[PDB]
C-alpha cells in the first residue's frame, strides 16, 4: 500500500492510505466557559478530550438552564481536522464518559480550583455535521 | 479591558497549578469582624482588640487590616448593614425567637441584591419572578399590602381604607416580603420611619460569612419553602466563653477564609455590569 | 327546519361555540407556533 | 387493564420530553390546605379564604380546586388525620414540648400504611419485621405493654397483673409502638377511649407535605435510630406572621406540587393491589 | 405497577397447575366476622371468641388472624361499614320488613364505590349514568327530590317551597337514591344528621361475602329492576341456633374464601373511595 501510494503520488494520481481509527485528532484536555465567576458556582460551558480517532465532548450547565430562553442551553464544539478524511466509518453516543463524575479542576489561568458535579442528561437536538 | 461583554474564557486542562495565594491575599486584604456588644461585655478587656490583632498577625494578617466593628444587637444591625472589607465574618448570637429575623439578615448580607427605589404612595407594585423581593429597613417599618384583580379593585380589602389592609409586617427593624408574583398590591408602609425598595437576587455575596453562635440549623435564605440550603458562609459554633469563640475565629481564620472568596460584583473586571 | 325567531341567529349562535371549540384552539395555537417561529432567531431550539 | 399483576414496562433512552403538565395538573387536580386555627386567628379576616383562592387562580389553580381545611392543634388533628385532596399540604406549628407528637403525625401522613384490627384481652401480638407498628388513636390513647417468653410467661410483668406491665403512652391521641421483633406482648390499652392497630409501612405517601412552620428540623419520620430522612416532602419556614407563610405557599405552590406526587396506592393503575 | 397495567399478559394453555396455595393464603391473611349483637346474646358465652379462634387455627388460620365485630343491627352496620381485614364475612340476619335496606347494605359492601361530595345547598346535582348513584347515610338521612327542567323550574314542585318536593327517604341510616338520568335535581336532606355523595359503582368488591341468616333470596344489588344477580358471594342460609352457624361459618371458612379474591382490600377500611 505504502509503494503504491508513493508511486501514485509521483504520478499526480489520486491515492489514499486506509486507517483504522486514524491518528487524526492532536492530544488536548480543554474546557471553555461561557459563564463563569471567581467563586465558579455557577458556570455554563464544555469540556472536551480530542485523543487519536476519538472525540468527547460534555456541555455542563450548572443551573440546568433555569433561567436560559426557554429552558434550552446550547453547546457547540468544532474540531478542524489538519487533512481530508473520506470514507469514514464513525459511532457517535449519546453520552461522555470522560466528563460524567466529580472532578476538580484547575483554574483557566491555574490561579485556583473549581468544583465539577455532572449529572448526566439526554443531550437535545443532536446534530453532527461534516463540513469540507 | 474588555468590560462590557462576555467573553468565553478557554481554559486547558493539565495547566500547573498556581503556588498558594493564601499569604497575598491575608497580606492584600483587609478583613472585618462583626461581634455583638455583649461579647465585648462579657470579655471585659479594653485591650482585647490589640490582643486579637496580635494573634491575627501570628496568624499571617498585617497588624493594621484586621478591623472590629461593633453592634448591639441583630436586630439593630439589619438596618443598612454596611460591609466594606475584602472578608467580613458575623457572629451572630442565636435566640429562638428571633428565627425569621436572622434567616433574613442573612438573607440581606449572605446574598447580592440589586434594589430599586419604590414610591407606595404613587404606583401599585408586583413582583415579577420568584427572585423579586421587597426589603424594607428602618426603625420602626409596618408594611400591610392589598392585591388587586385585574380591575385595580381589591381583593379581600379596599384600596380606600388601609384598615382593611393584610398585615405582613409589624415594628420590622429588618424585612424580607415575598408576595404572589404577577399580582398588583396596594402598599401601606410607615414610610415616615423606614424605606422599602423592590429588589433582585442577583446571587451569592461570597465576602460575608455568618457564624450563628449558640444555636441549631435554622436559618432559610431562601424563600422556596422547598429549600433550605445551608452554604459554605454560614457556620454554626456551641459557646460558653466569648473568648473562646474569638480564639476558634482567630485559629480557623484560612478555613473561614477559604468558604469565602473575593465580592464578585467588586474589582475591577466586574466593571460595567453593575459595580466596578 | 328554521323555527323562526331561532333563524334570527343561527349562524351566530353556532360560531360562539365553534370558536370557543378544540378546532379553534387548535388553529390558534398553529397560528401562534407559526408567529413565534418566525419571530425567533434563536428562540427556536424549542422546536423538536 | 391488567389490574393485580405486574408487568415490566421498557423504554428508551432517547424518547423526547413531553410538554410540561403542570398546567392541566392544576387545571384537573384538587389542593387541600390543612392550618391551625390560630392561623385563621392571627390573619384576623373571614374572606381570607377567597382572597387566598383567587391568589391561586393567578397560579392556574381554578376556583373552588384549593380547599382549606382546619384544626385546634396538631394534638387534635393527630386524632384520625383524613386527607382526601389530590395534594395535600399540611401546615405544622413548631413547639418542643410537642417534638415526638409532630413526628408521629408526620410519620402517619407521610406514609402509607396496612392496617389490620388489633383484639387485645385475646390474642397476644408480635411486630414480624421492621415495618410492622402499633398506631394506637383517640381522645385518650394510654398503652402499656408486658413483654413474654417462649412459655407466655411474661418478662418483668405479670399477666394476670397489669400494674406490672411496661407503661408505653400515657394519654395520647395519636403514638406509634415499636417494641422488640419476635416477642410476643400482651397489651393494656384504653379500648374504651382508643383503638389500636397492627400497621404495615408499605411506602411513602406522595402526595401529602408537611410544612413545619418555624423551629428547627426535628422531624423523625422512621422509627430506626440511625436515619432521619429529611424527604422532599418535608419543608421548613421561619415566620412571624401567617400572611407572609399563606403568601410563600401560594407563590411557591409549583415548587411544592412537584415535591409531591399523585397518590400510587390510590387511582385506576394500583387496582386490585390494594385500592381503587 | 401503573407504567404496566396497560400492558398484555399472555399466557400458555400448558403452564403446570400451582399447587393449593389456601395454606398459604390462610397463615399471610387476616378474617373479620361481622355478626349482629343477638348472636352474642343467643350465644351467652364470654369466650366464644376464643373457641371459634381456635376452631378456624384448628381448619389452619392462624392464632390471632381471626377477627369479630360486632353491630346492634342491619341499620345500625349501614352507617359508615368499615371493612378491616383482607376477607370480610358478613352474618347479616334477615327481616322480612328491612329487603330494602339489607340490599342497600349488600349493595354498598359487595361493590367498590368512588364517591364524591354534595354540596346540595349550591349546587343542582343529576346522575351521568347507570352507574351513578347518591348514597346518603347518617343517624336519619331524609332525602326529597325537585326535579327541574331546560329552563331550572321544577316539575312537580317548587324550588323555593321544599313541601312541595317529592320524597325519596325518610329516617334512613342508609340510602341509595336512584333518580332519572341527564336531569338536574335540587335537593333537601337533613345534613344535620345526614351526609350525601355522588357515588359510582366502580365494580364488585371480591373480598367482602355477604352470609343471610334465614328467609330466602331477597337481596338487589343492581338498581336495575331487569337484573337481580345473586353472586358467589351472596350465601343463604337457615338456622335455628347461632351456634350452628357460626359451626358452619368455620367448617366451610375454604369455601367461603374460595368464593372470595384477595387483593380487593383498600388501604382504608371504608365501603368508599372518598374523592375531593
Ligand atoms: C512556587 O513554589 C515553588 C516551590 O515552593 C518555588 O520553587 C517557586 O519559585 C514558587 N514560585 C513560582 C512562581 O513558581
Ligand atoms: C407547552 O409548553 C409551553 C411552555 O411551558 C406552555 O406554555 C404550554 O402551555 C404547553 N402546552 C401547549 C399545549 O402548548
Ligand atoms: C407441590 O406439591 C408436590 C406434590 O406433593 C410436592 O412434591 C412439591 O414439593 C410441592 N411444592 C412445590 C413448590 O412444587
Ligand atoms: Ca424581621
Ligand atoms: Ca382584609
Ligand atoms: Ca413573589
Ligand atoms: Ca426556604
Ligand atoms: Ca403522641
Ligand atoms: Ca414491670
Ligand atoms: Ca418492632
Ligand atoms: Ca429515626
Ligand atoms: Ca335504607
Ligand atoms: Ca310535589
Ligand atoms: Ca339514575
Ligand atoms: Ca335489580
Ligand atoms: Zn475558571
Not at chain 2, 472589607?85 to 457572629?91: G, I, M, P, Q
Request: aromatic residues 10%.
Amino acid at each position: 500500500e505504502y509503494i503504491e501510494n508513493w508511486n501514485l503520488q509521483n504520478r499526480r494520481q489520486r491515492t489514499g492510505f486506509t486507517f483504522h481509527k486514524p491518528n487524526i485528532f492532536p492530544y488536548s484536555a480543554s474546557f471553555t466557559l461561557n459563564r463563569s465567576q471567581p467563586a465558579h458556582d455557577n458556570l455554563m460551558g464544555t469540556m472536551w478530550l480530542n485523543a487519536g480517532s476519538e472525540i468527547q465532548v460534555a456541555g455542563f450547565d450548572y443551573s440546568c438552564a433555569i433561567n436560559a430562553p426557554a429552558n434550552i442551553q446550547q453547546f457547540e464544539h468544532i474540531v478542524q481536522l489538519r487533512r481530508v478524511l473520506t470514507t469514514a466509518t464513525i459511532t457517535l453516543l449519546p453520552d461522555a464518559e470522560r466528563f460524567s463524575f466529580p472532578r476538580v479542576i484547575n483554574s483557566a489561568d491555574g490561579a485556583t480550583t473549581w468544583y465539577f458535579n455532572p449529572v448526566i442528561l439526554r443531550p437535545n437536538n443532536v446534530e453532527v455535521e461534516f463540513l469540507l | 479591558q474588555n468590560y462590557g461583554i462576555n467573553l468565553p474564557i478557554t481554559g486547558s486542562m493539565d495547566t500547573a497549578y498556581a503556588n498558594s495565594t493564601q499569604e497575598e491575599t491575608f497580606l492584600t486584604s483587609t478583613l472585618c469582624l462583626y461581634y455583638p456588644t455583649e461579647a465585648a461585655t462579657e470579655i471585659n478587656d479594653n485591650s482585647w482588640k490589640d490582643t486579637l490583632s496580635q494573634l491575627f498577625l501570628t496568624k499571617g494578617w498585617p497588624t493594621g487590616s484586621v478591623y472590629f466593628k461593633e453592634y448591639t444587637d441583630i436586630a439593630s444591625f439589619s438596618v443598612d448593614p454596611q460591609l466594606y472589607c475584602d472578608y467580613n465574618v458575623v457572629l451572630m448570637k442565636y435566640d429562638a425567637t428571633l428565627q425569621l429575623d436572622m434567616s433574613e439578615l442573612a438573607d440581606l448580607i449572605l446574598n447580592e441584591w440589586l434594589c430599586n427605589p419604590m414610591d407606595i404612595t404613587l404606583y401599585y407594585y408586583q413582583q415579577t419572578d420568584e427572585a423579586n423581593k421587597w426589603i424594607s429597613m428602618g426603625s420602626s417599618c409596618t408594611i400591610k399590602v392589598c392585591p388587586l384583580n385585574t380591575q385595580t379593585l381589591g381583593i379581600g380589602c379596599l384600596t380606600t381604607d388601609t384598615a382593611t389592609f393584610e398585615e405582613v409586617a409589624t415594628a420590622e427593624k429588618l424585612v424580607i416580603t415575598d408576595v404572589v408574583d404577577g399580582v398588583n398590591h396596594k402598599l401601606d408602609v410607615t414610610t415616615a420611619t423606614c424605606t422599602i425598595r423592590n429588589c433582585k437576587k442577583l446571587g451569592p455575596r461570597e465576602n460575608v460569612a455568618v457564624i450563628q453562635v449558640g444555636g441549631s440549623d435554622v436559618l432559610d435564605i431562601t424563600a422556596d419553602p422547598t429549600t433550605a440550603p445551608q452554604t459554605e458562609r454560614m457556620m454554626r459554633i456551641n459557646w460558653k466563653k466569648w473568648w473562646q469563640v474569638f480564639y476558634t475565629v482567630v485559629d480557623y481564620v484560612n478555613q473561614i477564609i477559604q468558604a469565602m472568596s473575593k465580592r464578585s460584583r467588586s474589582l475591577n473586571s466586574a466593571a460595567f455590569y453593575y459595580r466596578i | 327546519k328554521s323555527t323562526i325567531d331561532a333563524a334570527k341567529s343561527m349562524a351566530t349562535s353556532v360560531m360562539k361555540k365553534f370558536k370557543k371549540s378544540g378546532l379553534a384552539n387548535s388553529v390558534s395555537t398553529l397560528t401562534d407556533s407559526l408567529s413565534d417561529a418566525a419571530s425567533s432567531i434563536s428562540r427556536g431550539a424549542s422546536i423538536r
